[PDB]
Design a protein around this ligand. Structure first.
Ligand SMILES: CCCCCCCCCCC[C@H](O)CC(=O)SCCNC(=O)CCNC(=O)[C@H](O)C(C)(C)COP(=O)(O)O
Ligand code: SF4
Ligand code: SF4
Ligand code: SF4
Ligand code: SF4
Ligand code: FES
Ligand SMILES: [K+]
Ligand SMILES: [Zn+2]
Lengths: 96, 115, 209, 48, 60, 119, 129, 699, 87
């Protein structure tokens, strides 16, 4: 999520933060450094992994045409849960 | 081949001629614009600027080329005596706001990577 | 027609214009160098530069042509071709509801006779072409810049001219007047190399030079 | 909205904001990327 | 009045996907539609060489 | 109308993950070249963009961008009203775009729901 | 051919006097005339059949407000396609640009034989297809 | 004669018998679509897209693996051909995942363009696509195996150009997984070239990882300086940064391959870099400062000391313009102590005769040689492209490779004469069995490496190998133009330094300890502060501060090999120009612009003021380093021979061991490579096991 | 002391004018190196380059003398003159 820089700035999702000297920091004074709190990085981790039982699983992303191009994730490597490259939803086989 | 169609002039000489009445017209033209256009430069400060363009344009030798810019100069003179240009347009000849650019290699080296 | 996407073809118009192509070619073999009709029924009359005035008068005055409307007067600057600029006229025939295109070539220096006499519409088109490209037109009533700013140097539509240009403008307070400065973009124009490395049209394949 | 409530989700704001131009809450643009070229930090040990 | 009364049913773009982008429905399920949509919005359709002058009766 | 074109916004999936996978299609179709994005392999491994500055002073609201990305990532909101007092405020970055996405998400979900069948 | 007082001009064409290129950008800039290389990650060779002239690269500094690629050389994103090399270079002297010419690199003709993949003694027998 | 007359689309072409159909239509410009046939690789016909319509024939033919004969008209644009093109391509796109929005190859995507040219505009597939598990085969190559389609390109490249027989296919049917079966780690000096031979976006550059996309990036052509082969590369840059390095095409130089060292090393340009001039403060810590005082301090005390007390040791990645600038500046104070890191035997011809210190036979020459004699070197990690040519000629022409030195593997069978240098004189006498083989060989060849000459007996081996070359040159088995003697170099800018007149080695500096040392690009760390006397003014130029900057008083920052217009010459004397891609970072300037500016303030102003001027002067010193991309074939091997047997030295007993022995030491060579993180990851990948390296990416 | 810091010849591999110096280095070169081992006689060569001799004396000193169509003994005397003044 959003942490605080040693100067007092708020690090964004990309990790950008104007450092100590960083003359550019003058703009934020008398203003705010716009930062979005809903960090995408940790807003997808807590989503549970589907325990669907098959070998190839499609992922429309929800809503059909509202989602993303239908990709088939291979749920065969029994070490790491397969994730759709478009939305990050983790899918895994139900450990046989 | 070498044979090319000339614009107006038939060799250098009358090509050298046409640049003259352009200078003849330009020289007569300087003092009234300084008055009409309300310029900040002196009457003397206009003749040099009229002058310095001319042998700035001195390496040119082709008769067709010479006649080509004497028309451009005539057109520039044309668009000047009807106050079609403005104070800003004329003043653009005087590179005023643009700070002087260095010339020596060492100064080129100090400022930035450029020839 | 089973095909619902392909544009329909009009062979009758194609034959009709091609016959007129042989017509104009035979009447003026002195200037007409090439005549062709495109697949979409457009006739291009490839003339020599000195034929700008004679050929135009023929299509404007001959009873069987009667092209009495100057549609447009353009040039396409091709840096490749020896004489880069290529002056293009488009004429519309009211009586025979047909359109013709006379195209001629010209370098930077050689002038082209102004078509103001045969087509008084060309007069303002004449000024634009010189202003944008630098093709000087001979014996013109008044050749002058029509589009660029007063005192603007260079010919913009010329290919060698940069997209952004050389001169910017801003207000400078120590002079209390708009002043010109060398161009300095806050963002350079991101040029895109969006050309497929695969041949697109076998029909228009150039000979294996 | 009373008849048809919009579908609610986590990230949707709970407090609408007017255009904050002028007030000290106004948005200021700033580069969101990291540094491209860093520099070789000089050593702390002396010259010798 | 005539255009409203004689409106025909059918699609609104040329069926040729190499010229007009495919609809979003086939975008997200079919290989060829996505490939065409990708190239069309990045490269665009390459038109054949040639020149033409088309004029229409614009209100002016 | 539901298909009105206005202030842009970068929406995100129902889970919360952002839709933009940084395919640069919107930048490649931008007629005014207002889109400027750079991507990077994120810590999770997903493919997101480090920077998504949209210059609201260049683009002309063609709407091609909403037609461009195959994940409905960028889309102009119904908010025709975002006039600012300074030029800098109009130059939007990724952070402002996401904030607009989080603010008008109710409208974009509803408007797109209405018009996703016409397209 | 025209009977229009054909003067035999001999001096090499120089229109730099009229194009309006500022003094910095006409002498200092060096253009390079080359055939573009085939993009190695592709396989088609359509982009390597036209000579192209491009100018040298200049400073690219990041804008203070937001990280940009701001430059101050107008002759940066200006390439020009040319059919043949001599026609391409003829543009360079005519516009008075100090040019540098490469040569048209073309794939040397190879000899491919599917029968070689299975030889009796020659050590070119492919291990797997 | 022999030419067979065949027709394409009616037009008749003249083709050499055995020509394939695909080549025949290429002679007229018709490029048959392909996915399996690579010109540099073998032919397999797995593509099934090159199917073309033969005139008056019932069967569509594979244009790739089909020898065309007379009386055939290749109906390329026939309806039968287009239907076959349509049919197989629909099969190709059936199981392609909907990824290319996120697939990095989107933009090149050999599937996309061919689909946009030869393929339908809609999909009639109504079933579920297959998904394939990803296999990790490198921290530098990504593998989304679910995208790629029945390669035979990855497989042939590994088994023919790299020799590593680890890539393969596993199974049959629709799946038939292509990969390595067991968890293996595909590392080779040319492993990275599988990325640019992949038509599909499965094998993708892991360091790239969606940094940018093709259309937005600008491509500039330059020459790599990481090795001494001098591979032509394309530095794709955008917005003022380098994302990718692509291999150009030059046939005899590098074909279309580059080493992984040359490919995934651009990130070093973004690692530890010098930006501003730095000088020592009162306490002894380098501190940033303006250009004037850094130059003034250098110029001020360069003026004081003169004579042979002002030295300069040029490094590895140096500009010929920089070398000549330093040479002229450091000779107006009369100091002919210009040294360099690499050492070449000065006994005899030394640098006088060009024939000594270059690959005389040229790289392309090894593709027609009969026997070769690699002596005390590991070309795989010294000059990877040169080793590929040996393999290519070994593969096709059946060259008989012989290796005297370390038993290091070279992706082919080599006859290990041994490692003791005593073998060299045995071959020269003729008692050794290999001596007569070189006699019977019609194009025999011997090559030495600068690594071997780096030993204490460099003169001994060079004289011995020169004696060997003449001992078979006296026999007329060699042709009148064959150049038997060859010296393979490792440091890029060492031929230019030797050509310019720079004294090879560093022994000159040790014999006379100078007072001002001009470390210009030097990073080998051979001359530390202990060798030179107290209070030396070690001035370090360069780009990456690795070992020169820590031991210095002035840190004048220079540009890098992608930030200038320098001239680098390869190992065979082919001066190539490297064009500017991205401007130097920070306040650093070009290299020759340092010395020229330094000379002006110091007082001994150099004559040349522009880039064209310094090349003209660079022409004055030597007339070959200006002629670009042409091997100025030298001569005079024989006089350098009797000039060489003067000293006669004496061989030691240490076996010839190249510094590079295992893939591990390959990546860590130069300042650019050491700085880069991706190079460190590859070194980690090969040091410990085959599983502790992976970049999280779901591309 | 300006004595013969280095000597540089630039000949063409095939130009008939360069034939003379090629014969010179073919025969009268090994003796020259043995006579002045310290003095480096650079033979940087090229194509289509007229036969040319460069001499490098002390601080920034260089003199030029063409060897066009020079005979064998003609160029030996030319170098003998150059290295005669070893100062
Ligand atoms: C306030 C602003 C006011 C307005 C400010 C000035 C406004 C613009 C004025 C026109 C500028 C234009 O670029 C040039 C033109 O009109 S014409 C060039 C004449 N070019 C030649 O004639 C051939 C080359 N030059 C020579 O042949 C001789 O060197 C020379 C003529 C110089 C002296 O002759 P001498 O016999 O050697
Ligand atoms: S709305 Fe159109 S012009 Fe504006 S940023 Fe999007 S694509 Fe570009
Ligand atoms: S906003 Fe849309 S078009 Fe732009 S990068 Fe993201 S997905 Fe692609
Ligand atoms: S290979 Fe990659 S870019 Fe090409 S079609 Fe498949 S997913 Fe798209
Ligand atoms: S990565 Fe490329 S070469 Fe390898 S199997 Fe896939 S498509 Fe074939
Ligand atoms: S090209 Fe793939 S089969 Fe011949
Ligand atoms: K690839
Ligand atoms: Zn998904």
């Amino acid at each position: 999520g959003v942490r605080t820089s040693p100067t007092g700035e708020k690090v964004t999702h990309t990790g950008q933060a104007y450092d100590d000297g960083d003359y550019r920091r003058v703009r934020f004074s008398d203003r705010q450094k716009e930062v979005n709190e809903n960090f995408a990085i940790d807003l997808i981790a807590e989503q549970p992994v589907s325990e669907v039982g098959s070998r190839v699983i499609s992922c429309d992303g929800g809503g059909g045409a509202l989602g993303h191009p239908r990709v088939y994730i291979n749920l065969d490597k029994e070490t790491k849960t397969g994730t759709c490259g478009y939305c990050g939803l983790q899918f895994r086989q139900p450990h046989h | 081949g070498t044979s090319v169609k000339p614009i107006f002039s038939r060799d250098m000489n009358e090509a050298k001629r046409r640049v003259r009445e352009l200078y003849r017209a330009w020289y007569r033209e300087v003092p009234n614009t300084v008055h009409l256009f309300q310029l900040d430069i002196s009457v003397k400060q206009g003749r040099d600027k009229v002058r310095e363009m001319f042998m700035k344009n001195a390496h040119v030798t082709d008769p067709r080329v010479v006649d080509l810019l004497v028309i451009k100069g005539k057109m520039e003179l044309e668009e000047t005596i009807n106050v079609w240009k403005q104070r800003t347009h004329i003043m653009r000849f005087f590179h005023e706001t643009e700070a002087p650019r260095p010339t020596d290699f060492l100064s080129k080296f100090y400022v930035g990577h450029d020839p | 027609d089973t095909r619902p996407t392909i544009r329909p073809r009009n062979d009758v118009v194609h034959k009709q214009l091609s016959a007129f192509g042989q017509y104009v070619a035979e009447i003026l073999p002195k200037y007409v160098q090439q005549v062709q009709v495109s697949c979409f029924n457009e006739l291009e009359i490839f003339i020599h530069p000195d034929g700008v005035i004679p050929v135009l008068t023929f299509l404007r005055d001959h009873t069987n042509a009667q092209f009495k409307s100057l549609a447009d007067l353009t040039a396409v600057d091709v840096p490749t071709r020896q004489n880069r600029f290529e002056i293009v006229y488009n004429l519309l025939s009211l009586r025979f509801n047909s359109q013709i295109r006379v195209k001629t070539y010209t370098d930077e220096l050689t002038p082209i006779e102004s078509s103001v006499t045969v087509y008084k519409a060309a007069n303002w088109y004449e000024r634009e072409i010189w202003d944008m490209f630098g093709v000087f037109f001979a014996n013109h009533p008044d050749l002058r810049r029509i589009l660029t700013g007063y005192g603007f140097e260079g010919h913009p539509f010329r290919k060698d001219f940069p997209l952004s240009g050389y001169v910017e403008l801003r207000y400078d307070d120590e002079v209390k007047r708009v002043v010109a400065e060398p161009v300095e973009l806050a963002q350079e124009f991101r040029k895109f190399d969006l050309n497929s490395p695969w041949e697109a049209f076998p029909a228009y394949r150039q000979p294996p030079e | 909205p009373t008849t048809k409530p919009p579908t609610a989700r986590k990230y949707i704001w709970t407090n609408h904001k007017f255009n904050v131009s002028g007030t000290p809450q106004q948005y200021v643009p700033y580069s969101t990327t990291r540094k491209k070229i860093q520099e070789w930090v000089p050593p702390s040990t002396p010259y010798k | 009045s005539q255009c409203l009364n004689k409106m025909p049913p059918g699609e609104i773009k040329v069926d040729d996907a190499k010229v007009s982008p495919p609809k979003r429905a086939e975008m997200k399920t079919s290989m060829e539609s996505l490939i065409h949509h990708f190239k069309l919005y990045t490269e665009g359709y390459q038109v054949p060489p040639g020149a033409t002058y088309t004029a229409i009766e614009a209100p002016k | 109308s539901p298909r009105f074109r206005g202030e842009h916004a970068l929406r995100r999936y129902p889970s919360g993950e952002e839709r933009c996978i940084a395919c640069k299609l919107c930048e490649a179709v931008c007629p005014a070249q207002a889109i400027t994005i750079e991507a990077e392999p994120r810590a999770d491994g997903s493919r997101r963009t480090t920077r998504y500055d949209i210059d609201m002073t260049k683009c002309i609201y063609c709407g091609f961008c909403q037609e461009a990305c195959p994940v409905d990532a960028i889309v102009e909101g119904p908010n025709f009203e975002f006039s600012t007092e300074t030029h800098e405020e109009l130059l939007y970055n990724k952070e402002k775009l996401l904030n607009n996405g989080d603010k008008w998400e109710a409208e974009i979900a509803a408007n797109i729901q209405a018009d996703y069948l016409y397209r | 051919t025209q009977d229009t007082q054909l003067i035999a001009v001999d001096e090499k064409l120089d229109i730099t006097t009229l194009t309006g290129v500022p003094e910095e950008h006409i002498k200092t800039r060096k253009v390079r005339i080359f055939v573009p290389a085939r993009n190695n990650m592709q396989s088609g060779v359509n982009n390597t059949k036209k000579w192209k002239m491009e100018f040298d690269t200049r400073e690219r500094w990041e804008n203070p407000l937001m990280g940009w690629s701001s430059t101050a050389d107008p002759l940066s994103n200006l390439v020009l396609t040319f059919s043949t090399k001599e026609d391409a270079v003829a543009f360079a002297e005519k516009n008075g640009w100090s040019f540098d010419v490469e040569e048209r690199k073309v794939p040397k003709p190879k000899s491919k034989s599917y029968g070689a993949n299975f030889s009796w003694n020659k050590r070119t027998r492919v291990s797997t297809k | 004669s022999n030419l067979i007359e065949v027709f394409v689309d009616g037009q008749s072409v003249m083709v050499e018998p055995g020509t394939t159909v695909l080549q025949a239509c290429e002679k007229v410009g018709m490029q048959i679509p392909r996915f399996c046939y690579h010109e540099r690789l073998s032919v397999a016909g797995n593509c099934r897209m090159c199917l073309v319509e033969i005139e008056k024939a019932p069967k569509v033919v594979a244009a790739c693996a089909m020898p065309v004969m007379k009386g055939w008209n290749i109906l390329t644009n026939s309806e039968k051909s287009k239907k076959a093109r349509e049919g197989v391509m629909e099969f190709l796109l059936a199981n392609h995942p909907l990824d290319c929005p996120i697939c990095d190859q989107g933009g090149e995507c050999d599937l996309q363009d061919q689909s946009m040219m030869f393929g339908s505009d809609r999909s009639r597939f109504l079933e579920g696509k297959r998904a394939v598990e990803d296999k990790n085969i490198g921290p530098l190559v990504k593998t989304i195996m679910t995208r790629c389609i029945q390669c035979t390109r990855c497989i042939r490249f590994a088994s023919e150009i790299a020799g590593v027989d680890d890539l393969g296919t596993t199974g049959r049917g629709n799946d038939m997984q292509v990969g390595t079966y067991i968890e293996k780690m595909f590392m080779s000096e040319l492993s990275g070239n599988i990325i640019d031979i992949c038509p599909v976006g499965a094998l993708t550059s892991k360091p790239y990882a969606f940094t940018a996309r093709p259309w937005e990036t600008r491509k500039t052509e330059s020459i790599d300086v990481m090795d001494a082969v001098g591979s032509n590369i394309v530095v794709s840059t955008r917005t003022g940064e380098v994302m990718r390095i692509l291999p150009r095409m030059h046939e005899d130089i590098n074909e279309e391959w580059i080493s992984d060292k040359t490919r995934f090393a651009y990130d070093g340009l973004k690692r530890q870099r010098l930006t501003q001039p730095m000088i020592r403060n009162e306490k002894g810590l380098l501190t940033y400062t303006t250009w004037e005082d850094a130059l003034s301090r250098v110029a001020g005390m360069l003026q004081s000391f003169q004579g042979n007390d002002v030295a300069a040791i040029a490094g590895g990645l140096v500009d010929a313009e920089a070398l000549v600038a330093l040479k002229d500046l450091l000779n107006r104070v009369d100091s002919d102590s210009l040294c360099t890191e690499e050492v070449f035997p000065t006994a005899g011809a030394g640098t006088d005769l060009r024939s000594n210190y270059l690959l005389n036979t040229t790289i392309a020459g090894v593709e027609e040689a009969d026997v070769i004699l690699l002596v005390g070197t590991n070309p795989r990690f010294e000059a990877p492209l040169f080793n590929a040519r040996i393999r290519k000629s070994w593969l096709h022409n059946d060259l008989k490779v012989a290796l005297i030195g370390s038993p290091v593997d070279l992706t082919y069978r080599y006859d290990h004469l041994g490692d003791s240098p005593k073998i060299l004189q045995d071959i020269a006498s003729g008692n050794h069995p290999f001596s007569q083989i070189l006699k019977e060989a019609k194009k025999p060849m011997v090559v030495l490496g600068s690594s071997a000459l780096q030993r204490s007996d460099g003169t001994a081996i060079l004289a011995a190998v020169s004696n060997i070359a003449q001992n078979i040159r006296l026999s007329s088995g060699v042709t009148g133009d064959w150049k038997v003697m060859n010296i393979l170099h490792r440091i890029a800018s060492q031929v230019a330094a030797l050509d310019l007149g720079y004294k090879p080695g560093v022994e000159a500096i040790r014999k006379n300890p100078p007072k001002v040392l001009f470390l210009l690009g030097a990073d080998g760390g051979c001359i530390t502060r202990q060798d030179l006397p107290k209070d030396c003014f070690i001035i370090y130029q360069g780009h990456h501060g690795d070992v020169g900057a820590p031991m210095a008083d002035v840190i004048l920052p220079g540009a890098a090999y992608t930030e200038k217009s320098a001239t680098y010459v390869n190992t065979e004397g082919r001066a190539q120009q490297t064009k500017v891609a991205v401007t130097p970072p920070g306040l650093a300037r070009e290299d020759w612009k340092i010395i020229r500016a330094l000379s002006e303030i110091a007082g001994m102003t150099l004559p040349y003021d522009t880039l064209d001027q310094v090349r003209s002067r660079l022409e004055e010193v030597s007339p070959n380093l200006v002629r670009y991309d042409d091997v100025e074939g030298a001569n005079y091997f024989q006089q350098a021979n009797e000039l060489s047997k003067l000293v006669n030295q004496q061989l030691l007993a240490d076996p010839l061991v190249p510094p590079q022995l295992t893939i591990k030491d390959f990546y860590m060579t130069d300042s650019i490579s050491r700085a880069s993180q991706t190079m460190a990851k590859c070194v980690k990948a090969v040091t410990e096991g085959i599983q502790a390296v992976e970049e999280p990416s779901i591309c | 002391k300006l004595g013969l810091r280095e000597i540089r010849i630039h000949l063409c591999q095939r130009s008939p004018g360069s034939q003379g110096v090629r014969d010179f280095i073919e025969k009268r070169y090994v003796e020259l190196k043995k006579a002045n081992p310290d003095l480096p006689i650079l033979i940087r060569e090229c194509s289509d380059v007229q036969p040319k001799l460069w001499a490098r004396y002390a601080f920034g000193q260089e003199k030029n003398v063409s060897l066009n169509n020079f005979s064998a003994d003609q160029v030996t005397r030319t170098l003998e003159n150059v290295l005669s003044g070893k100062a």
